[PDB]
Structures are given as C-alpha cells and as structure tokens.
Design a protein around this nucleic acid. Structure first.
Lengths: 66, 66
DNA sequence: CGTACCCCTATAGGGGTACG
DNA sequence: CGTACCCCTATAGGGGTACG
C-alpha cells in the first residue's frame, strides 16, 4: 500500500477525504464536479485496496501519510 | 465537544468507526443488530455535532480521543 | 440506557463510455 | 490523466415508536 502510486489529483482527493470532507464539498473545494471527484475516489480506493473512504481517512492518519 | 458526554455504548461504536469499520461489521463485532448500531451512531453524531462517520473518525485521530 | 424496528432521503461506490 | 457523465446497488443517516 503505497501513496506514490496514486496520481496527483487522487492525492488531492485523499487529502480532503482524510480531512473529513464529503464528495460535494471536495468538488467545490477543487472547483470540479462531484462526478469527477467520485471517479478519483473509486480509482484511489481500488489502487489502495481500501473498502471505503473512512478506511482511507483512518489509514492516512494511522500511517501519518500527510 | 467532549467524549465523556457520550454513553459507554456510543463510545464503543465511536472506537470501531475510528478503526474504519462499516456499520454491519460493527454490529457483528458487538453482537447486536445493524439497526441498533445505526441508532448509537446517530445519537453519537448529534451529541458530538459531527456531520458524518468520517468526521467522527478524523476527529478521534486528530484529537487522539482514544 | 440499550435494544430493534419503522419511515424516508442522502451519500457513497463500482462498473461502463467518451474526449481534449 | 483529468474531466464528466451513464448505469446500477449499497451504505449511511435523521426522524419516529416501542419496551425490558
């Protein structure tokens, strides 16, 4: 499970997720549609082999990735 | 925002959420139905003024509640 | 309090295609 | 890659009643 294997934008989303933001807020924050955010989210989840955004949030904090 | 304001069972749920577990898994781990888990989660969220289980997980880690 | 439902809407997520 | 949608099911959440 390596964070370097993610694309920049995927790391942008993971960071906002780890801060507790719902997809709609992440979209407004990055000024892109929720649709696009949701695409990055599932790509990130599959790559990192995580089952949900909460697991990604927890993982990011436990492993102090950011 | 104080963790002591929650009931014991609500802290039980909060801990499992901060470990990234979905409600169904929390029910099986605690040996209660998913319905009951959802009640505790709902109560916990309102009392702690959190908008989602993700904010609850992120809060627990940032403030090192547990 | 903790248990376990009911009702409903909102959010998330997993597959796909398409195109600068 | 990043964008933005399509499809769908799954999960989450907010209100309620009930009862030992």
């Amino acid at each position: 499970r390596d964070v370097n294997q993610l694309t920049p934008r995927e790391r942008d989303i993971l960071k906002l997720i780890a801060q507790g933001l719902p997809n709609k807020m992440i979209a407004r924050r990055l000024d892109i549609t929720e649709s696009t955010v949701k695409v990055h989210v599932k790509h990130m989840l599959k790559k990192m082999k995580l089952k949900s955004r909460v697991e990604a949030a927890v993982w990011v904090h436990q492993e102090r990735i950011f």
